[PDB]
A paper describes a structure:
Biphenyl dioxygenase is the first enzyme of the Bph pathway and the major determinant of PCB degradation. The catalytic component of this enzyme is a Rieske-type oxygenase (RO), which catalyzes the highly regio- and stereoselective insertion of dioxygen into an aromatic ring, activating the latter for subsequent catabolism. BPDOB356 is a typical heterohexameric RO with αβ protomers arranged about a three-fold symmetry axis to place the Rieske Fe2S2 cluster of each α-subunit within ∼12 Å of the mononuclear Fe(II) of an adjacent α-subunit. Structure of the α-Subunit - The α-subunit of BPDOB356 has two domains: a smaller Rieske ferredoxin domain and a larger mononuclear Fe(II)-containing catalytic domain, in agreement with other characterized ROs.
Residue numbers in the entry:
A (entry chain B), C (entry chain B), E (entry chain B): 1 to 186
B (entry chain A), D (entry chain A), F (entry chain A): 18 to 457
Write the structure that this text describes.
């Protein structure tokens, strides 16, 4: 369910998807991770659909009675809130050789696990939840560890990878961002 | 042990020289907590963060956690987020609404004014026959209160009762603040969501940049950020540069601002055509021009500003932040977005999305700023590098760079007059123990 | 083998289990992780069998000749040593809104990988080894990273998830516990 | 540089005030290592940890790693886990059995007494004709030895030869220790497994809590912990509270204990009905009453105790721990469980499982304790918060709170008399350089 | 492709491999991880082929125009550059009880994910890319986290595990090695 | 505040005693940065790292990042990797080729000599009519330059203009360096790839070990490392030991070397039969013997050496490294491999693979070295352990241990004469402010 609160668990289907579909989704994510971890930003950008919404909300620290205010809602400030056009600009920056935050480039590893797939009513469209561990190191000694969950809408596509990312919502397991920037893609 | 003469020697505004020790010395940082952060007006947030009675926001004054809370009489009180019993954090939430603040350790309850109102077992353990007859009075044990003043939406706080009032503290810098804060009679409002991130650098690098440093943006710091906003058919060779503008140094306080004149290019790159049009043309822009008559605001573009020590913002883009110090080698950026309360919904939305795109932990401009600051701090770890004499000579003794259309001391857009002013006032606060001489 | 020393590797079957069974076990674990990472403690507790033994032994630092003393044995002090009744109490605490260690609640991510399944002699009963990375962050800046291995006994059940946890032994890759508490479930 | 007068000013027992600097100041911590931890009796473990000849346990005295080892004559010796050659850790294991301790760097071997017995190439490199003829003697190069004394199972150590003996050091607090330690002629035994975890807080918060702080348990710190032990049909509204009891302050040393009277509710919540019955009714309880005649132990429930500075335990629950300091902002808890050696097997098992459930790194009580302490330490990072005057007035000048059935100075169960005593003795150790005045 | 630059992404086949093959490769890696994480070094060494080349190049920090110099090339200095004979010596050290760097032994967890398999032209020979998270803790408080990518050549073998490692190249997501040593196998 | 007398008391070479405070004291470390690292000749790399014009290598002098760059006249210049404007790192790459070094913050460009050649907007902002007419001159704002001297391939640097030249600084230790550096007229070359790793220990432990400590290798530190090189049919019981050899202490400077005589066993274990043969027999070995006539180099095996303070190498194995200090509790090892430029390709390859196998972050020898050092540093955190008097008596007053075949002061292979010399010179540099007395 697309509008499930990010505080609440993913709405997995009654029974798990087929072996074949699980394999294809996982293999797509592994290939996506390969592109990012080897700085193939143009190839990675090709996987983003024309109607992509790339969104990472701000998480807050709340006590018992106001836990419904944990996530800063849509239509407010966020870490990422992007379209195909704005992501294009980000990619232009990353491949410019003038992006000082990423020149010298960061060494990254996108660990992809806990992949749960749900088949949506539109044929070829899937809602997918996954856990991630993003290890980032740069220059001499800087190390930043990111963990969390991604909730994607994926569509079957005629590209070599077989899929395109239609929507991406990133749950980051941090309130205050502990890194100096978010100069890496999730 | 630092002497007033030794501290003053670290900053030379007459010769444009800075001692690199100011950015990394641990003993100097401890003196900053007492002599700068302990008696300066510091920005905590906006009035719209706490609109209703009982609404609170937990924030910082230096490294001290504080509670900013709206009172029953619509006033705002600020007190230390520390229980007077054993020092436990009273409020553990980022914000919300409360009728009382209760400590989780022993259950000491405080009202929204910061008064200790409930002590469990007071009758059985703290007194004999009546409350207070054995030397324990709840009125004696409330957390430290800070002075609270608001300036057109922004909430400022100061510990020192001897310090000057906010407006006197702001010197001649208020019109420059009004470019963002006083455009409409409706005032401003904060878009929900304060973004918090950690940069391993000294607070002065960030404070100076927004105070006096247009130089970095006009050179090579943000070439990739500008390219990010350009269409596929356009590149950096086609876009001009920008060389016309001025900067402002406050008469007192170390406040500073800088802007380009008659060129919307630098603003257009960050905020886009829709905001640029709103900022310059139409009823809203005309109203703002009337409300800020001391400045030719319609001719000003891409403004940067710092209200000393740590309140920084960019009028036009409307990002605003406090740099919370975390030692000499670290800072926390607490940033939010301000919009005119009466602005059309599509304008508010544009401000929201363009800010996330640009001046944000993951923004195309902000990420390159931090990378510079972190690397400076890392080099400062070296023995020779920490005592280096740094160049703050930019614009010094250079004639005919002022602009009579602007109030106060002005210089060229690419200058460090406001920077020299910031560090001079820094050295004043660090070397003068009394407000008898420090006050304007 | 249930009584394999925790210092020794898991006794995997001669040949790996079927694709279908591997999928069902993994998907169960991903769903279990979703519940914990989204603080659905009552739903998570429902997955624990009535005869559950939840156990996490203390690990010690030993030289060559006394390596057999690495693990503090069963029937001695431990990090966790729990039944259905004691786990019920833990859940009551977690959902009380008075558990100060978890109010405000921690942000967690249970990364589940290296799943090895063994079919036991009792039909529907499985012994499962898996590696975990538990990322925990709370309040402003606190971050605790836990890594190790889980050795479970799982039974097929008529619940929506299809399985119940009959036994859980947690190998934690730490001797001295580096976090201030163990206020998260493994 | 801290003067004796400046140190004494940090603690005011006559007015019930504490300077928050005691919990975070780095210079004060260094003085603690010398003047407190360097000359106090510190608990290392139990005799049952090292029952046989050659058995050893590696532990700490402050931040100094030490080896606690059983000798051939059944005595216990304690010496620094540091090779006298280049400082390498001699023993890298948590415990076990040894005939010798060998350094891995250059192969210097020490016997179980801590004497240097084997130096590789001594004949070829260290001497000319006979061992010692060139100034090198193995007898000169053994690791620093500590004074060792046992009190009814517990092993204590002290570096200072000028310090008083253990029993004199324990003042009038020994009967209160016996409630857990001297219940039977069979003595106590430690359940296998010392649990070690790291809490980022000052040692004094933990030491004070077990010394004088029943207040937190009787208020809101452990509401969720109590609920954890309640059956599905019961909640917190049905359970009473508890308000009858006393606390004890030692005549010298800063030791303290607190307990409830004639109410097993707080004990029952932690240990359950089986242990509560064992603690109060039957031959074992009757024997304990005879062995500790100075206290009405059968009427005492949920006792807490600290033997200054860092030995803390809870008689009835029988958790016991040492708080190993790791700077002013961090501590390591080394905890284990004690049972009566002659207790029935089902009672020993119940003690084992109830302890893991409650007072353990993952226990339902312990986890809420640490969370309070960590947050206090985090707030103390602030400049204003670190110098706050904290309230230690609880019970001060409050009359008729003593109990004549108990030896020494007594106050109400909810009081800070024992706390004021702890911090007063702390200030004494920190300000008085000689045992000529410090000794009781 | 064996000679693909380590800076460049893995050359995955046109379509992902079969479900069966993916399962067998993953299960082999999980079993390999079990052996290392439980210090079964002799059993682990048996998985290394007679012609094994075990190699971990040094990574450098480079700006835009000299990014082709990121990896210190083959035939130069490296973190690991090993044959069957030299690895045998390493194993002899690890099992000697005189390896002070590993006595007391480290507590390790080899998280294996992002497994991408490619079938080579030689029947039974596979090229496999995978991401890893190596958690290492030892003694009282030491913690070292390693992340990166492994590119293996695997051959089918008549051993109980079914595979032997013919080649292993380790991409470590670090330039300066942040641990005091590399006394663990990757 | 440390006095010269208090510093000298930390090291006693006449009695063979060392105060453990030298390895962990923060105040002593800060004095090391000024009085040791700030005026010593430090190794940065090899000439082959920067063979062509414009080639650069970024490295360290203590904690100061520096750029080592080849000039147009084939000379080498070394300057601080810090922009004089606001302190930004000028070069962010490990190495490569450059025509200019440009700062990313404000675009200040420096030539390969370290001269400031381009300042953006200098005409508009820094001067009035002509460059320099307002007090700003680019010649004034270049990064700090270091003195540069090469010794047979190795590049050394020193900040202090008052310091002695490199060769005078090297005292009588140069022949011992030539065993590795001057074997052929073709010189040496560095194999590509500098391995960098972080060890949490003091630099002096590593520096001393390579200076004077064959003792650890001949005892139990490397038993497992030796076993790693043994064939399946051989074990540690079959291999001998080695007891014949000498060590060298420099007349001035604290340099030291140690080696075995007439026994290739220790070398064979590390480098194998092919290198051992190359090192001892054939035209290359014969040539080396002629080129180093002051030493019987063909009879020397498994040599270790330290050029004070932090340049360490092992002739025969040909690993060489700089220990970059990172506080008193941490060091960074920057290691590379040297080979004779004219050596056969199979010999160069053997040197390459044997080095990775042995003296490398993951090497079978190196890993056991670090483990010892890290544990020493961890124990030093204790209050009693940090002030321990350590034994440096090895070989002191022991007669007839010198060897007349070797120049300068010599002792037994298992001795700490070179160690005592290292720490004595350390104490001299730390206590004597002027080169008027410090110079040889
Ligand atoms: C400090 C921070 C940001 C800017 C700035 C950059 C681009 C456009 C307008 C202002 C100037 C100084
Ligand atoms: C310090 C630690 C624990 C307790 C305590 C809590 C509940 C029941 C009995 C004792 C009191 C002070
Ligand atoms: C310091 C470092 C290494 C060695 C060394 C070890 C084995 C063989 C040759 C030299 C001696 C001192
Ligand atoms: S600390 Fe707040 S009530 Fe005791
Ligand atoms: S350090 Fe223990 S023998 Fe040298
Ligand atoms: S810091 Fe290098 S140009 Fe400003
Ligand atoms: Fe900027
Ligand atoms: Fe408690
Ligand atoms: Fe060595």
């Amino acid at each position: 369910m697309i509008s499930t609160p990010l505080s609440k668990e993913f709405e997995w289907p009654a029974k798990p998807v087929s072996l074949e579909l699980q394999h294809q989704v996982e293999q797509f994510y592994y290939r996506e991770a390969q592109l990012l971890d080897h700085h193939a930003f143009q190839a990675w950008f090709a996987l983003l659909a024309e109607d992509i919404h790339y969104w990472m909300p701000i998480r807050t620290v709340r006590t018992a009675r106001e836990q419904g205010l944990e996530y800063v809602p849509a239509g407010a400030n966020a870490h990422f809130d992007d379209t195909h056009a704005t992501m294009y600009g980000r990619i232009r920056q990353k491949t410019s050789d003038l992006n000082w935050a990423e020149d010298p480039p960061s060494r990254t590893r996108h660990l992809v696990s806990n992949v749960i797939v749900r088949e949506m009513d539109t044929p070829g469209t899937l809602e997918v939840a996954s856990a991630f561990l993003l290890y980032r190191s740069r220059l001499e000694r800087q190390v930043d560890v990111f963990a969390g969950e991604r909730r994607d809408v994926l569509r079957i596509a005629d590209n070599p990878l077989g899929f395109q990312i239609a929507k991406r919502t990133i749950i980051l397991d941090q309130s205050t961002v502990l890194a100096n920037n978010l100069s890496v893609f999730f | 042990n630092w002497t007033p003469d030794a501290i003053r020697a670290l900053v030379d505004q007459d010769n444009g020289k800075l001692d690199a020790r100011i950015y990394a010395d641990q003993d100097l940082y401890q003196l900053e907590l007492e002599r700068v952060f302990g008696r300066s007006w510091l920005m905590l947030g906006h009035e719209t963060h706490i609109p209703k009675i009982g609404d609170y926001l937990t924030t910082y004054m230096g490294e001290d956690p504080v509670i900013m809370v709206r009172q029953k009489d619509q006033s705002i009180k600020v007190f230390l987020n520390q229980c007077r019993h054993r020092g436990m954090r009273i409020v553990r939430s980022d914000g919300g609404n409360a009728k009382a603040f209760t400590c989780t350790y022993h259950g000491w309850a405080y009202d929204i004014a910061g008064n200790l109102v409930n002590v469990p077992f007071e009758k059985e353990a703290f007194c004999d026959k009546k409350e207070g007859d054995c030397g324990f009075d709840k009125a004696d044990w409330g957390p430290l209160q800070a002075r609270v003043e608001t300036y057109k939406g922004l909430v400022f706080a100061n510990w020192d009762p001897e310090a000057p009032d906010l407006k006197t503290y702001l010197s001649d810098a208020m019109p420059y603040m009004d470019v963002m804060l006083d455009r409409t009679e409706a005032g401003t409002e904060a878009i929900g969501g304060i973004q918090k991130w950690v940069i391993p650098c000294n607070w002065k690098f960030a404070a100076e940049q927004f105070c006096s440093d247009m130089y970095h943006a006009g050179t090579m710091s943000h070439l990739s950020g500008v390219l990010a906003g350009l269409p596929p058919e356009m590149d950096l060779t086609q876009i001009q540069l920008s060389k016309n503008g001025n900067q402002f140094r406050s008469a007192w306080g170390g406040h500073g601002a800088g802007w380009f004149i008659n060129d919307s290019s630098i603003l257009l790159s960050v905020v886009g055509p829709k905001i640029t049009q709103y900022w310059t043309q139409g009823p809203a822009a005309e109203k703002a021009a009337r409300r800020v008559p001391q400045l030719p605001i319609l001719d000003m573009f891409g403004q940067h500003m710092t209200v000393f020590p740590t309140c920084s913002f960019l009028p036009g883009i409307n990002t605003i932040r406090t740099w919370h110090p975390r030692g000499p080698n670290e800072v926390e950026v607490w940033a939010f977005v301000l919009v005119d309360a009466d602005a059309p919904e599509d304008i508010k939305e544009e401000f929201r999305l363009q800010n996330i795109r640009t001046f944000n932990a993951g923004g195309v401009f902000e990420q390159d700023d931090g990378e510079n600051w972190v690397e400076i701090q890392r080099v400062m770890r070296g023995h020779k590098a920490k005592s280096t004499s740094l160049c703050a000579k930019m614009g010094l003794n250079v004639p005919n760079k002022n602009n009579p259309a602007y109030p106060g001391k002005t210089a060229y857009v690419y200058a460090e007059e406001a920077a020299r002013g910031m560090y001079h006032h820094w050295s004043r606060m660090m070397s003068e123990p009394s407000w008898d001489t420090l006050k304007p």
